[model samples]
Target: NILWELLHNMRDHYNEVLLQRWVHVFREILDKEQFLPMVVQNTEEYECIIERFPFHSEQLEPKKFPFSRMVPEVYHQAKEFMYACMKFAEELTLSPNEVAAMVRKAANLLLTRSFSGCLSVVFRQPSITLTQLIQIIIDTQYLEKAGPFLDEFVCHMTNTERAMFHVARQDAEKQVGLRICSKIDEFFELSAYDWLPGIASAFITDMISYLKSTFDSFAFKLPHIAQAACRRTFEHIAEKIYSIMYDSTGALTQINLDLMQCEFFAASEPVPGLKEGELSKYFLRNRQLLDLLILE
Candidate 1:
């Protein structure tokens, strides 16, 4: 009964076009080959903690973190970055220069979300500081072993010599993992190479384990509103930051277009045969999937 309903709904809301669009976007943000590994790894660790510790709102002051409150500010920052990149791209008509800034901002936004977003949703704690979070991540052991790669990823994102932390969704996907490191290095160079490998490797493995387990254990079906809320929250954060980056840098347009066009959901073909309600139903059926919420 459940399976049938889910498939039906999926046909309605997400068709080939939609799927393609989303896949494209996903590929743009993280290398297609490396997406799964990073996602899985981060999911794994998140599960490890959730299993033993249910999130209690009490841990967060007013059930929110000081850093989480900075979402608006971060969004502004990203907007500024985007603006600069767009301005330069248009003035010079240089794709490479435009891509460079876009990539840099993407990397930063990705890292920032991994750090703060994960804490907010997974632990239900808003008080988690970046430093404290990084320290705990170091304990994950994946970071300790990855050596230069881990360090490089952190250095690139934080733009500092301090240790990098947090995991990406693609870090666990076998295909996605292969290219993520190289892609970063290609964009950021050897300076990034030094720490990113280790950071990415550790973060990826743990996250995968966490999400998989979460999917398996959580029983109740998630409502469409809940799922949509989660997805919107994540997208909101990312987009907000992207907008801020645009203002700071003056290169917003190109980055926004690339991002929209590259995401899997964005790229996927729209289902012509089904109604919006049907698609909503399909998503609700799959609401239990941990991966579904990972992005949000």
Candidate 2:
């Protein structure tokens, strides 16, 4: 009671608002840059990191992308933040309830700020690669689970707070659905112009190689995503080649289904679950006609 009487006037100095303001002061320093992973690992263990060459982002050559590219160590900042909160409590003689509340509020502030504050404009971007998209998705989930609050706060995670990862989720849905197919389309730009029915072409080989390397970069742990991607690729190429085969002086040569099927078998045999037989339905009509031509 003696200490309480002596410090009675000091109550206003450390009230909720001031304590909350102090939190944001530290909050300003913690950022997405510090929260991102620095490098793609040696093994293909990372979900969407690029291990081969420079992949998409760096290949841009001097043109800027996503404002300086953030990432690396998230722990140092988080730990430092935690330490600050600890000292903020112990020195101020605040109790556990007071200290825990400050930490929780601070975390909620960072996440609610959408991981970008005055740096909001920096997030504006025209496009992102599949690797970038994947990293962001992983990054958000990682960051949401990170912090001093850990178990103390995560279980109490809210729908509003989950908005933090909404943008990342959108990219996952959009990119995974659209980009790969468009990429395969680019690979066949002049298919009708030069493709021959004499034998299976390097075009299919080139695509298979690209798909294999690209998919290999992702962790083997991805079964559904990997299989869906493979199936999408197969269906897309099948349709494109089907259209191209009938574009002009169509499927006229003796026939190449024999060699074509071999490439198909080789591609699906190695990895991913998109099988040659299941996908034969995609090209069965063309295959039948192509085979009919063979019997003549």
Candidate 3:
């Protein structure tokens, strides 16, 4: 009985060591030969597929593509990678569950890296708008085909979304500044009471409010960075108004005062501190009023 027990113990120990060696060898083969080759093979396959789609290679209009040209490449890579995973699993005798997990992981890694790199290239072009970026994400349909591993990749895009919003906010701010300058000149020329503090304050306030609303509308779905930038722009415009109206020694400059009085008379309004009957004298002093009146 003792001899039998010793022989059985030795056999069990040998089997354990053999099993471990088998697993280690399989892993080595999978890593060096199967897995690494699959990555390279799938990448080549992707390029080949993209080459077949001649439209992708052409210099099309920016408006035509929702996604960057890299999208088709990555999509094809994922598909080929899936096939390679199955083939590798069959050759290595991996279980179904293990094969699924392996494929999902490898494909996810490839897609995530590809998309992140592509976004960097896309954003470098000033012609690419936020609308185009968002449409590209929608058109790619990555989540539908990327299997369960895509949630992580989607979450990674939040950072990119925030960066895009920052670019959009800067552009919006610049346009807002230009519009404000243009409209301010128009308000000075058109208003009947341009000299009155009340009229100037109302005009500036309305202009600022309209600009804020425009920014808010454009930035509705964007991240907080955009909203904060919009707020800063509004504050900057308000500061300029305060400086112009209150910090200039409580008096309008002579040139501005004359322009305002001339506009007021052109509209046939009584100029403050001037006789209502003496408006003709002011109008005569500034002949530009006759031209403005005739144009009106």
Candidate 4:
């Protein structure tokens, strides 16, 4: 009774005035309200969550959550007000469609606000590692499933804007591929691995382990994107390896070339993400060139 009492009298005097006031107040909440704090909670916690991406034995996410169960007060307060509006619609002769517009608008703002916070956190880094990028992917993926009203609010924005969370996911995948290529380049640039004996596999083990976790862990869940990423990445890697080997053409003594030839399998077969012969496959023509260079 007390809850409804403040606006209840307006129903008698001027229902149109109550409806207008309702729009002004609800619009104020939806427009001025901040949901980022509620989305990621405190800045200290959010920063730590982004920086540290811990590992588990096998699968992750369920065993330990990357995000918390924090729902925004914007949604809750708007919801309670909507319920009040729903009841009053009958008395005030307002259509439910009019009320539903407010509901959809509130959800749209919530979607935009929540994802903007995530984007700010992610792109803050000037240089990000695969671990860091993958962590962002995993966290954002979980954030999509975190909230209770998320799915209900999901339909509201279906008309035009793609969910910003998906935008984050796509960008995170972009960084992952870019990170992979640059990291591979780093290993080669740091020591001039091309000048070494065969395929210079000092980093292959760890590199494959990196791929192992990516392909093995999230591969099951989001492989559509991840697989596409890996294919493009591995193609670039294979071609790079071929070109790097070609860089040391003068150094390709028959002995060095033979060692290099055998090491092709070391790379081609061992990678977790690439099928058998992929490294040798992309560089396969180069493999023939390796033999031809040996003859010269």
Q: Candidates' TM-scores?
A: 0.18, 0.50, 0.33, 0.52
lDDT of 2 by residue, 156-197 (tens): 432113143234433444455466677777767634444344
Output the lDDT of residue 251, model 4. 52
Error of 1 at 84 (Å): 67
Model 4 bad stretches (over 4 Å) = 1-63, 66-96, 106-110, 113-121, 146-148, 151-164, 168-170, 193-206, 213-217, 245-250, 253-280
- RMSD (Cα, Å) of candidate 4? 12.9
Identify the leading candidate in terms of TM-score: 4
**Candidates sorted on lDDT, descending:** 2, 4, 3, 1
Report the CA-based lDDT of candidate 3 relative to the real structure. Answer: 0.41
> Which pairs of residues collide in candidate 2?
36-72
What is the descending TM-score order? 4, 2, 3, 1
For candidate 1, write residues 34-94 as lDDT tens digits: 2112112344544443332222222211112212212222233333444454455556664
Clashes of each: 120, 1, 0, 0
lDDT string, candidate 3, 167-278, tens digits: 2334434433444444445543433332433233344445544544544543444434344443344344333333343322123343344335433432342212323434
lDDT of 3 at 293: 36
TM-score of 3: 0.33
TM-score of 4: 0.52
